[PDB]
Design a protein around this ligand. Structure first.
Ligand SMILES: CSC[C@H]1O[C@@H](n2cnc3c(N)ncnc32)[C@H](O)[C@@H]1O
Ligand SMILES: CSC[C@H]1O[C@@H](n2cnc3c(N)ncnc32)[C@H](O)[C@@H]1O
Ligand SMILES: [K+]
Ligand SMILES: [K+]
Ligand SMILES: [Mg+2]
Ligand SMILES: [Mg+2]
Ligand SMILES: [Mg+2]
Ligand SMILES: [Mg+2]
Lengths: 381, 381
């Protein structure tokens, strides 16, 4: 009957992969605070009792990695062995070297900033959809908000049995509308969250429905047929890195569009602007959102790609799902006349030397807080 | 004029992320050889001189991790300090614990195999396209074949300056055809490959065009306008983990569809069949390829999703790009009548206790070697 289901997930600040993303971006921010031109490629790994930093940094900054890592873990909420992880007493191991000189010479040494080469080859996508004001899929927006609500109720003490590691998943029934999509109802919600040894399962399931789901999801989307999977494993006392190893860049779909649109594969966290995996994906989001908010499309996917050492993108592509009166070729021409997607120009347009990256590393990089890539460009055409 | 560009990338066996995927799957295979029911979640991290294994394994097998890791690195070709990495002398560190008992009790303990719960929540996609016989995008097929050719010419000694770490990227111009896509020509090729200190840049660029590209890419796709970026960084002597940290699950788009279709975010390597990130993505590929090879569609995207501890998928969705006379609802009904996407049934249909996983961990998991998920199911409708 013209309807379909679509599912997206999100994870909380204490999910072990997301811990790693936040630490990687805390390290990036610490460098950028002192050296705006720091070259940073910081991967983090987390397992029981351990944060390991591994990668490549060339920077004039003097960074105390023990302090930066432990402060990030403190903020997430892992502050006691009873919770499975403690910033005060965990192991922090560092395996960081300089950036390869072969990369440096091929990318940025003795190059004018605007003409810096891409820091790697790769492909990146941006996406926007008019189904929400923030131009994001409803599935992923709701999933993120459910994790944020859990963290809020943990931190305000009203659900003191909550721990930081959580996952959520939202399935929405949609109608198709000339290539655009229209949310109808929420079909299924999953919530799994780490908890203390004392609270019982029925108390948790009742609280997750009444204090989390109902606080977040408009009642108009929930009905007698909605399916709830709340603490479906039955027990989640062991959690965080103790329950599951974490790595940076293992939540790339949570970080972006929740399965909608597409992904080029590259992780965001721990990387400075010369790594186009991040900067060009942010720019592609900016393009996509500019096209939708500018009234040219209702829904759009943008691809860009690069070669290491080369400034201009190798390819740019626009896919509008049939949601514009203009052809995709016409939209591509508008994009090319209004945007300069060299990394050394993106950095200026999106202010990408500013140390705001830890703020991006939970709850998605897009659709929130009026970051520069979320402020549409006025298009001339 | 109805044409568009699309870009995909691939990486070689010695790319540091791919090293980690191959080691993770070597560990999985080693366990499965002795214990077909091993529960494995093995992440690998690589940096200069180091392989670290971190994660969770519960298994009756007795596995010599030092031997398994070093044999995998040997096969890749890192056998001397002059190449940046040596299986004989690198550090192998192990941070492996049992699977969380809370996960085990919620997923598989005291469950009938067919009724085992999904090992996690999540979403997964399968994709197929009739543009090649193997039902894969031409962009990604060509990119993989370029890396395979590099490894072949390295191993046969005809380009003895080659080292194992490589990346390739292919941009194809396509025409749209009633929702299907038709490749026209290759617009741009990138190849970057690690090399010895003695070979010069012009020799490498000439060999990459004449002995690699021309050996792989049909001449009909290459013309006077094709752009070549061969060793675009100018120097790539430092490579492998020394040049760039590697982690398991950081090449998920290379592993799948090269930007085409969609991805749910979950990595494949190092995981047994109860981790639906892998098994349900393989099953979704199997569904998609069955629909295309069965003549029901020319191009199709399949989504499935799960909740931890629950056997049946929470959602199934079919998107045919307009390439079927049947509606998406009709195709979904055909899928539901022909496939059982419980993980404890997928394991039987796709033989997922068999230790063949290291073979999947380079050159893409799909479109090759007639693995069970590549053999179409005959559909009844
Ligand atoms: C199943 S392991 C993958 C993720 O699922 C979550 N998880 C861990 N243990 C459990 C559990 N017992 N029940 C439900 N989810 C869990 C954690 O966020 C982990 O990172
Ligand atoms: C740029 S670092 C990311 C990837 O690019 C490759 N790479 C590393 N060094 C170089 C180099 N000097 N030139 C081109 N590619 C490189 C390696 O495959 C690495 O994993
Ligand atoms: K893991
Ligand atoms: K890296
Ligand atoms: Mg993970
Ligand atoms: Mg990358
Ligand atoms: Mg990588
Ligand atoms: Mg996963």
């Amino acid at each position: 009957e013209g309807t379909f289901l679509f599912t997206s997930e999100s994870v909380g600040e204490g999910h072990p992969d997301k811990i790693c993303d936040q630490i990687s971006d805390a390290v990036l921010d610490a460098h950028l605070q002192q050296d705006p031109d720091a070259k940073v490629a910081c991967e983090t790994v987390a397992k029981t009792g351990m944060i390991l930093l591994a990668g490549e940094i060339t920077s004039r900054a003097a960074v105390d990695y023990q302090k930066v890592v432990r402060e990030a873990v403190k903020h997430i909420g892992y502050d006691d062995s009873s919770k499975g992880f403690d910033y005060k007493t965990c192991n922090v191991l560092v395996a960081l070297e300089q950036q390869s000189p072969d990369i440096a010479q091929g990318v940025h040494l003795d190059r004018n900033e605007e003409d810096i080469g891409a820091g790697d080859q790769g492909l990146m996508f941006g996406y926007a959809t008019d189904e929400t004001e923030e131009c994001m899929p409803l599935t992923i927006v709701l999933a993120h908000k459910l994790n944020a609500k859990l963290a809020e109720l943990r931190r305000n003490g009203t659900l003191p049995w909550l721990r930081p590691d959580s996952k959520t998943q939202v399935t929405v029934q949609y109608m198709q509308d000339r290539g655009a999509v229209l949310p109808i109802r929420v079909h299924t919600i999953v919530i799994s969250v780490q908890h203390d040894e004392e609270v019982c399962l029925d108390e948790m399931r009742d609280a997750l429905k009444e204090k989390v789901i109902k606080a977040v999801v408009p009642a108009k989307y929930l009905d007698e047929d909605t399916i709830y999977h709340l603490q479906p494993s039955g027990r989640f006392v062991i959690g965080g890195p103790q329950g599951d190893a974490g790595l940076t860049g293992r939540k790339i779909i949570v970080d972006t569009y929740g399965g909608w649109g597409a992904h080029g594969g590259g992780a965001f966290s721990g990387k400075d602007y010369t790594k186009v995996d991040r900067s060009a994906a942010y720019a592609a989001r900016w393009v996509a959102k500019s096209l939708v908010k500018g009234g040219l499309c209702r829904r759009v996917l943008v691809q860009v790609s690069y070669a290491i050492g080369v400034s201009h993108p190798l390819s740019i592509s626009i896919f509008h799902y049939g949601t514009s009166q203009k052809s995709e070729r016409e939209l591509l021409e508008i994009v090319k006349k209004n945007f300069d997607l060299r990394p050394g120009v993106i950095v200026r347009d999106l202010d990408l030397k500013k140390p705001i990256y830890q703020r991006t590393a939970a709850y998605g990089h897009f659709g929130r807080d009026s970051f520069p890539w979320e402020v549409p460009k006025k298009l001339k055409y």
